[PDB]
Amino acid sequence: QKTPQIQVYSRHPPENGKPNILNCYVTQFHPPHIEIQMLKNGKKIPKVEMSDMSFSKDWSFYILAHTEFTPTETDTYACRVKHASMAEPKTVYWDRDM
Amino acid sequence: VTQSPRNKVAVTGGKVTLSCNQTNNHNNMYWYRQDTGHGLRLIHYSYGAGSTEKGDIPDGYKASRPSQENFSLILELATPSQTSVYFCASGDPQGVSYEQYFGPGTRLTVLEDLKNVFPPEVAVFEPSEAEISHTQKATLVCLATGFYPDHVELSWWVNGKEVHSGVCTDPQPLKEQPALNDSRYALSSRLRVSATFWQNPRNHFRCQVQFYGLSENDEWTQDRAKPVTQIVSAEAWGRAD
Amino acid sequence: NYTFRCLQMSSFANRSWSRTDSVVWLGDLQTHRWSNDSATISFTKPWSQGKLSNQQWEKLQHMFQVYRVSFTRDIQELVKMMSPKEDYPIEIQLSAGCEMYPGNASESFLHVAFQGKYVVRFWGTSWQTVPGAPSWLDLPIKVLNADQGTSATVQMLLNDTCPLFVRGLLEAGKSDLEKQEKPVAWLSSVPGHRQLVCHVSGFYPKPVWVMWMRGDQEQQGTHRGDFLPNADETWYLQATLDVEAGEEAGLACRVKHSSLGGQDIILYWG
Amino acid sequence: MPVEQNPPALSLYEGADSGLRCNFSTTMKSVQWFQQNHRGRLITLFYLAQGTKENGRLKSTFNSKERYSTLHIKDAQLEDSGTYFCAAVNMGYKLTFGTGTSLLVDPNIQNPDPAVYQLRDSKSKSVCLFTDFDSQTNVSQSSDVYITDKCVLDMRSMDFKSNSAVAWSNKSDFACANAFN
Ligand SMILES: CCCCCCCCCCCCCCCCC(=O)O[C@H](COC(=O)CCCCCCCC[C@@H](C)CCCCCCCC)CO[C@H]1O[C@H](C(=O)O)[C@@H](O)[C@H](O)[C@H]1O
Ligand SMILES: *[C@@H]1O[C@H](CO)[C@@H](O[C@@H]2O[C@H](CO)[C@@H](O)[C@H](O)[C@H]2NC(C)=O)[C@H](O)[C@H]1NC(C)=O
Ligand SMILES: *[C@@H]1O[C@H](CO)[C@@H](O)[C@H](O)[C@H]1NC(C)=O
Ligand SMILES: *[C@@H]1O[C@H](CO)[C@@H](O)[C@H](O)[C@H]1NC(C)=O
């Protein structure tokens, strides 16, 4: 059993009030059954698109979730992940500065 | 009902004699010839020993009924027009029936010169690995070449026994050089087996070509071997590869 | 030099619940997908059929449909044979495909993993356990090897079908395989030491050079992260530098890539 | 023509039920049906002076007044292939044969895979093979290249009923591709 690694990054340089794509790369997990939510100010984003699940040379699974988002001064964007290898769901926040 | 010979090669002008025999003790005996777009046409017939009646196409043929059992058809001066398949049949009036009982058939070939008679050269072409991989099947190819006249019989023999399953053969032969009056012939045949069956080295494949040429009665002056009625074969052993 | 990979993801939760999913890659580009909820393999590129005819592809797809149903039912039985020794949930992953080289050279493979550990391969004309595999796998292997029909199929797909297909695919999609996407960089920082970050995104292909510079001098403190993908089959890379306060002045981030044509991106820290 | 046989050629699938007809220009005393095999042998199927006759998968009827005779084939097999002759007895007790009906029983080729293969010889030329095509496939001709027509399956063949054509040439090296277009 392997615990997932979550990485949250934007596709284009983040410009407040300009449409962008937020990406959430989830890797190094096993079994493949995972649940990924993308949240804008704690609420689940509705038309979230997800890549086809694939695996690496080490046989661990990887998947990418992405959504259209518009960064602002007021809004907070996060990626929540549930996996058997974790007792409590892990949340990673998007920090434009990271 | 039997016929003798079953195949005959003659020269234009030669004296040919086709015989028929029946043991059923039938009164009537008939002589027919088969050609395309004509079916079978009656040449001569007989109602008993010592009697013979002209059929529909009797010109160029004579017939003798020496006894009840035998009825003969004679071609005193043979012509290429008489190159045909001759069928003989018997009819029994004493059994209140018009039913006739036909012989196996005799093929006759009238030629200008006997020096043009050629036996066939047989070759077996092993299946392509491309077919064996793709279809998981294997076709062998028998190819009879350079024989004259056009009639030949082709059969496949796997491990000494004749096979019919997976056999496909051409209906007629093809002229090797049609721009020639004395042109030799070619005929092919296929044998399809399961890929593994061919791939087995313990399986022996052999196609057999039965040529119908000259008799020991005919005279031969050429340096080449007499192109007599013979069997010419080509063989192949299955290979793993 | 390009690698073709068919990835299978089979899951068996219990005797009445199963799920199979597959993806196909040509290098770091996806050519096909096939989820459990779909009846046929889906092309993810306009060239995904390669140089195969519609009839050649129809026959190949049909053989994969039969394989998916057979695979599920065959593994569900092997468990009935293995238990109590093996129990649900069971994860099975297949990694097939052929590596491509210049000329006519090729090397095909079919690797199988049980519960994440590589246990079996298709070698020569049969399935065989690899070193380290557990002893209970000997019996299912003999059950799988009695299927001479499948061995002939896999032998045709690995030996002939895979190199032929990929060679057609590399010609059909060379415009996509040789695409050059210009990266876009930007700088940011996190907090008496700060951490400066240089984000590099949308570049294609993978080889990129990112360094924090101070003049013509490379900063050896540059920590270059992992390659993470963007949704449009382009890459994202970030390079960080840990600096003492006030020494951020004069720092720049230089980006080198094939698509820029010897004209590096140089971003100055202000 | 006193014995009119139609069609001259018939081509039916395996397991199909078909029938052959024989028409007469006058009132005939009897009828006799024959099957001529691919080996040239004539074998009597039926002899009738009246009524119907059934002999397994075959049936024959003779109507003197309606000037016809029929031959029915129930569930056609390879063994049914060959020329079917119809001969009636005319005034003057003369058996008259019709031109014939050549029969060809074809298997139902389900998944056609048209292909061309090059076969190497057993001794030390080369042959091309066009196989796994359908029934609605016509084989071409043409010049120092020889191409066979669709072959005729063995009447006793019980498996591997795949029709094919063969091509060869005097020329070497011969292009296997440019042979069947
Ligand atoms: C996708 C784009 C096209 C690219 C083409 C390149 C293809 C090359 C990639 C090759 C992909 C490999 C797929 C396999 C193909 C087989 C096939 O494609 O062959 C299949 C046979 O499937 C079966 O009946 C059996 C399936 C199960 C066998 C799988 C092995 C099980 C995995 C074990 C090892 C795990 C052991 C762990 C035990 C622990 C549990 C115990 C607790 C389907 O093929 C069948 O049907 C075809 C047809 O109808 O057209 C026929 O043509 C064919 O002859 C026949 O075998
Ligand atoms: C596919 O390629 C393999 C090679 O990886 C072939 O395997 C050899 O096959 C022969 C005959 O079956 C054996 O004697 C060898 O021992 C095999 N080699 C190995 C490494 O096991 C295989 O035959 C090929 N299959 C096809 C259908 O061509
Ligand atoms: C089988 O597995 C599914 C998914 O894990 C589960 O929801 C279902 O209740 C299971 N059924 C049984 C009978 O165990
Ligand atoms: C996968 O597809 C098969 C198709 O028959 C179905 O029976 C099975 O329930 C599917 N599983 C899931 C979880 O979608």
Numbering used by the authors:
A (entry chain D): 2 to 99
B (entry chain B): 5 to 245
C (entry chain C): 7 to 197, 202 to 280
D (entry chain A): 3 to 126, 129 to 146, 149 to 187
Which passages does the manuscript contain on this structure?
To gain insight into the mode of recognition of the A11B8.2 TCR for CD1d presenting a microbial α-linked glycolipid Ag; we determined the crystal structure of the unligated TCR and the A11B8.2 TCR–CD1d–α-GlcADAG ternary complex to 1.7 and 3.0 Å resolution, respectively. The electron density at the A11B8.2 TCR–CD1d interface was unambiguous and unbiased electron density was clearly visible for the headgroup of α-GlcADAG. The docking strategy adopted by the A11B8.2 NKT TCR was in clear contrast to the orthogonal docking mode of the type II XV19 TCR atop of the CD1d–sulfatide complex (docking angle ~100°). Instead, and reminiscent of the classical type I and atypical NKT TCR–CD1d–Ag ternary complexes, the A11B8.2 TCR docked parallel over the F′-pocket of the CD1d Ag-binding cleft (docking angle ~15°). The CDR3α (24% BSA) and CDR3β (24% BSA) loops contributed the most to the TCR A11B8.2–CD1d–Ag interface and to a lesser extent, the CDR1α (13.5% BSA), CDR2α (9% BSA), and CDR2β (9% BSA) loops were also involved in the interaction with CD1d–α-GlcADAG. Accordingly, the non-germline-encoded CDR3 loops dominated the interactions at the A11B8.2 TCR/CD1d–α-GlcADAG interface. While the overall position of the headgroups of α-GalCer and other microbial-derived Ags (α-Gal–GSL, BbGl2c and α-GlcDAG-s2) generally lays flat in the central region of the Ag-binding groove, the α-GlcADAG carbohydrate headgroup clearly leaned markedly towards the A′-pocket of CD1d. The TCR–α-GlcADAG interactions were exclusively mediated by the TCR α-chain, namely, the germline-encoded residues within the CDR1α region (Thr29α and Lys31α), and the framework residue Lys67α. The positioning of the A11B8.2 TCR α-chain indicated that the CDR1α loop would sterically clash with the headgroups of a number of CD1d lipid Ags, including α-GalCer, sulfatide and microbial-derived ligands, consistent with the lack of staining of the A11B8.2 TCR+ cell line for CD1d tetramers loaded with such Ags. Further, and consistent with the crystal structure, mutational analyses indicated that Met87, Glu83, Lys86 and Val149 were critical for CD1d–Ag recognition by the A11B8.2 TCR, and that Leu145, Thr159 and Ala152 also played a moderate role.
